[PDB]
Design a protein around this ligand. Structure first.
Ligand SMILES: [Ca+2]
Ligand SMILES: [Ca+2]
Ligand SMILES: [Fe+3]
Ligand code: NA
Ligand code: NA
Ligand code: NA
Length: 522
């Protein structure tokens, strides 16, 4: 009989990591969410129900979990005994308090011959840079699931990482360090009504990038020559807070600074999804990070992004898959992405171009199995791109093994534009690249056995609430040497047409943030 002085489900509900017979259900009791949750230091019973209908007359599964202080009174339920490829509704009750109703959906039975799948993927939602209008629109989509590919939170204090179009909202605290700091930052982001609606609408498959801990971290090495010892404690705090706020299974429970997040599942026989973790195990960025010429350092063949175990696990999944599609749901730019010239190349040291030997091992394995059904989903870069993936990244004449869809950010970077100052140059230098756009939004994918379609769903602005969404462009890939085909293209009403931004602005703006952090320590 817990009683509350304020409505406890301030962060809503969520579901995730669906399998054919179960799904994770999530909530958190947080009546005062930005001040640590406002809960007493005792375990609180939370009842849960799963039904076939939204009025809960046809309940199929129910139980009681004990929400505990040591996990910020979060609740993770693995609701099993469910049927495959079926929509369910779920809700929680604590004392007399009722959560919002959530909607979810189990996967098809393994090997089921499913004709179609629709999903969206998102990344990069800097709270200060704009409103979450993208998620208002996403919540109205008809999707089987959603992927989040990282930067679900950012770690900064206020007035540090400042958008070109202004910081319209403000982080709740100084730069986040402790478990409580991370919990409160997750609560700030998750309090947004639009994000909560998108969570209540679909099951999510999440994976993190850098800003869930700190900018451009690499395994246990923080950026800018900061302390490794302090960073390891910080990673443990960040990983715990992430678990507490995400609909993950119990095998993802962290143990100190370590946490199993990479994982695999198949959507019938249509698509095999490898959800990667390119932060937790990676070697340090070469050449002091940033955008630099390649070097013996960056080209060192021992350097890894995935780590040895994840690499082998991935090869095992790719080699044994009989699905129509093999998908890498991951964080960072995979295709060749030269910012310089052929003679004097310049590459992102934090992207796959910074880890070329690791990329070679993945491509060589894909070549060895003769695959041409590989799709890579990406975030991080705060703009939309699409590329044909060739078995030799230097030869457009080489065989196309797949495609990469790089999604823009939900908000990071501000209102943006259709085109930037360096767009024509980069496209010229990188002819495998078929698309650039710099408006905020997300990517919607529709998959059938012989065709993959990606729609880029974008808005003219995020600095004010209420922008309309449109499909800027749509591409289809059909597993042949013609690669990506543009099937739609529309100009965005009310959007800036061309800015003077260049890719280096993202690195520069993150470095200005760090400088401001240092100045604040006087
Ligand atoms: Ca970064
Ligand atoms: Ca990132
Ligand atoms: Fe980001
Ligand atoms: Na580094
Ligand atoms: Na080495
Ligand atoms: Na920092």
């Amino acid at each position: 009989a817990p009683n509350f002085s304020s409505y406890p489900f301030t962060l809503g509900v969520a579901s995730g990591d669906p399998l054919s017979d179960s799904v994770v259900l999530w909530t958190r009791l947080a009546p005062d969410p930005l001040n640590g949750g406002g809960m007493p230091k005792q375990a609180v019973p939370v009842k849960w129900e799963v039904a076939k209908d939204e009025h809960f007359r046809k309940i199929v599964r129910k139980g009681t979990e004990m929400a505990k202080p040591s996990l910020a009174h979060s609740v993770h339920v693995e609701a099993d005994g469910l049927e495959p490829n079926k929509v369910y509704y779920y809700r929680f009750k604590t004392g007399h308090e009722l959560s919002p109703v959530g909607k979810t959906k189990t996967l098809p039975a393994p090997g089921a011959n499913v004709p179609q799948m629709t999903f969206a993927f998102a990344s990069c939602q800097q709270y200060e840079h704009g409103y979450y209008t993208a998620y208002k629109h996403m919540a109205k989509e008809k999707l089987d699931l959603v992927f989040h590919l990282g930067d679900y939170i950012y770690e900064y204090g206020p007035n540090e990482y400042v958008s070109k179009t202004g910081n319209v909202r403000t982080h709740n605290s100084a730069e986040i360090i402790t478990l409580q700091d991370y919990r409160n930052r997750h609560a700030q982001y998750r309090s947004d009504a639009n994000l909560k609606a998108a969570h209540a609408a679909f099951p999510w498959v999440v994976t993190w990038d850098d800003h869930e801990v700190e900018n451009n971290y690499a395994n246990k090495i923080p950026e800018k020559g900061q302390s490794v010892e302090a960073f390891v404690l910080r990673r443990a705090a960040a990983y715990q807070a992430y678990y507490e706020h995400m609909p993950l299974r119990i095998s993802s429970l962290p143990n100190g600074p370590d946490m199993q997040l990479y994982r695999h599942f198949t959507y019938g026989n249509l698509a095999s999804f490898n959800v990667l973790d390119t932060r937790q195990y990676r070697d340090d960025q070469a050449n002091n990070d940033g955008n630099k010429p390649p070097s013996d350092e960056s080209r060192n063949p021992n350097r890894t992004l995935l780590g040895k175990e994840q690499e082998q696990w991935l090869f095992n999944n790719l080699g044994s898959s009989t699905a129509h599609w093999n998908v890498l749901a991951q964080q960072i730019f995979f295709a060749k992405w030269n910012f310089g010239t052929s003679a004097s190349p310049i590459y992102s040291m934090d992207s796959w171009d910074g880890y070329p030997a690791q990329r070679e091992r993945v491509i060589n394995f894909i070549k060895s199995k003769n695959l041409n059904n590989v799709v890579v989903l990406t975030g991080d870069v705060h703009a939309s791109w699409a590329s044909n993936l060739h078995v030799d990244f230097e030869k457009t004449s080489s065989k196309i093994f797949g495609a990469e869809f790089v999604g823009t950010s939900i908000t990071s970077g501000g209102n943006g534009a259709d085109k930037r100052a360096d767009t024509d140059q980069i496209l010229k230098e990188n002819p495998h690249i078929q698309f650039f756009n710099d408006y905020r939004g997300y990517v919607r994918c529709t998959v059938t056995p012989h065709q993959w379609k990606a729609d880029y769903r974008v808005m003219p602005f995020v600095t004010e609430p209420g922008a309309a969404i449109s499909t800027r462009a749509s591409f289809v890939y059909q597993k042949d040497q013609t690669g990506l085909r543009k099937v739609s293209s529309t100009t965005i009403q009310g959007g800036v047409k061309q800015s003077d931004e260049v890719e280096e602005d993202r690195f520069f703006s993150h470095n200005k943030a760090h400088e401001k952090q240092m100045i604040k320590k006087r």
